[PDB]
Structure formats: C-alpha cells, structure tokens
Design goal:
The structure is a homodimer. By secondary structure, chain A is of the alpha/beta class. Chain A has six helices and six strands; from the N terminus they run E-H-E-H-E-H-E-H-E-H-E-H. Chain A has a six-stranded parallel sheet, with helices on both faces. The radius of gyration of chain A is 13 Å and the shape is globular. The structure holds beryllium trifluoride ion (2 copies) and magnesium ion (MG) (2 copies). Chains A, B: One of its GO terms (cellular component) is cytosol.
C-alpha cells in the first residue's frame, strides 16, 4: 500500500534502494528522482505517502525539497537519508519538521523500520546527530 | 506485564498517574517514589521495565536518576516527564540516552502511547524542545 518516492543522485544506490523497497510486501510502488528538482516535479503530480530524500544532490537538495513540502502544506512523510553528519543539515531538517533523519551508516533493515515508524505518525532522529 | 516506577514529588499528580496506570490491563505493578533518592533505592531492589521521572524533585532530580540508571546499565526504559521547557534539562536527558522526554502539557493518553513506544525500542522527544 505504501507509495514511496526516492530522491538520490547516486544511480547505483538509488537503484539498489528502490529494488529492495519494491520487494517489500507493504510497498505498492517506488518513484525515482535523481535530484531535488525531479523530486518536487513528481510530488506536484503523483500521490506519495513517503519521500526518502538524500541531502546533497545537484540542482536542489533534499532539504530544499523538504522545505518546499512544508511551505506547500503537503502531508507527505519525509525521511532524510545522508552520509553527512553535518550539524547544520540536521538542524535545518528539524526546523523544517522532518519526520526522520537517517545516516547511510544504517542498514536497509534499519531504513525499513524507519519507514514503518514515520507511517505511524512517529519520528526518528539519528542518535549520532542528537549526539 | 510492565513493571512501572513513577518518581514525582507532587503527591496529587503522582497518585493520579499511578491509579490510571494501574487500571491499564498490560500494567502489572506501579512503584512510587516521591523524590530522586527514593527512586534509586527502589531501583536497587526491584526490577523496573519503565521509570517515569519528574525532573525537579528533592534530593536528586530525575536527570540524576536517569544518569544513575544508565551508569548501572539497567534494562529500564526511561521517560522523563516535566513541566519545564528548559533547554539544559532536555540536553542533559539526551546526552544520557533518555528514551522519551514528555512535557506535562501532554495528556495521559499521550503518556500511555509513549510507554508503548519506548518498550517497542523507539524514542520520543517533545516537539517543543526539538524546537
Ligand atoms: F548526499 Be547525501 F546527502 F548522502
Ligand atoms: F518538576 Be517536574 F520537572 F515537572
Ligand atoms: Mg548525494
Ligand atoms: Mg516536581
């Protein structure tokens, strides 16, 4: 039933993530975006329950996408996934009411749990970044 | 089922919280402490699945009890419940790996849901304090 959008600029990771998401029993479909611009374009057109957003992407970052979602009052759940432990990225995401913030140090099983958590109206913040 | 400890120095609130908790079908027992020192004495004697801790109490604050629990590595989830939005309190709790941090502006139903969240191995922080 889950309609998922994955915005990630590294083709190999995006592809791998999306393939594994598609094999999940509760996942209906997975939209792909290579940057923040394609991400917003898809959110302007398609039904999306949850967006998994990389931070550092060309054209528009995942944080910009999150802010757009908030400014437009979309109810999309947003999970930021990033390699970066930069405090400013986290602070900016929290100010923008992100639902979850996950480092790419986490596993795919970890990510899956996170998705379930936010679908249930809960939040999850990288322990490393709460710090 | 769940063995709960409530440390809260306001008698009426502590009494009321504990009665409602005891009425929960999945609650086995509720221990009461009126200050931080009593809470530690009880934790040195009985097993507790979740400790619900007020911050400002006599002798030792709930933040000190939380740090004590963590230093003893007890298998005890800790939910801090407080009137106060002080950033220092919240920062101290997070550094000690608090499981949930809940303002007394929340409802008993909110608190109940929080108890299940931490037992499910997840965390919950007051939106106000995340800022
Ligand atoms: F490039 Be992402 F932020 F990992
Ligand atoms: F006194 Be408690 F911290 F509400
Ligand atoms: Mg990137
Ligand atoms: Mg008090």
């Amino acid at each position: 039933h889950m309609k998922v959008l994955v915005a990630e600029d590294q083709s190999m990771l995006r592809d791998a993530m999306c393939q594994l998401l598609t094999l999940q029993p509760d996942v209906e479909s997975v939209l792909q975006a290579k940057n923040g611009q394609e991400a917003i374009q898809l959110l302007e057109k398609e039904s999306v329950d949850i967006a998994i957003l990389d931070v550092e992407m060309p054209v528009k970052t995942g944080l910009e996408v999150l802010e757009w979602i908030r400014s437009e009052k979309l109810e999309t759940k947003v999970v930021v996934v990033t390699t970066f432990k930069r405090a400013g990225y986290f602070e900016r995401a929290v100010k923008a009411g992100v639902d979850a913030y996950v480092l790419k140090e986490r596993s795919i099983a970890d990510l899956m749990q996170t998705l379930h958590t936010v679908l249930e109206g809960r939040k999850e913040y990288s322990p490393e970044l709460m710090e």
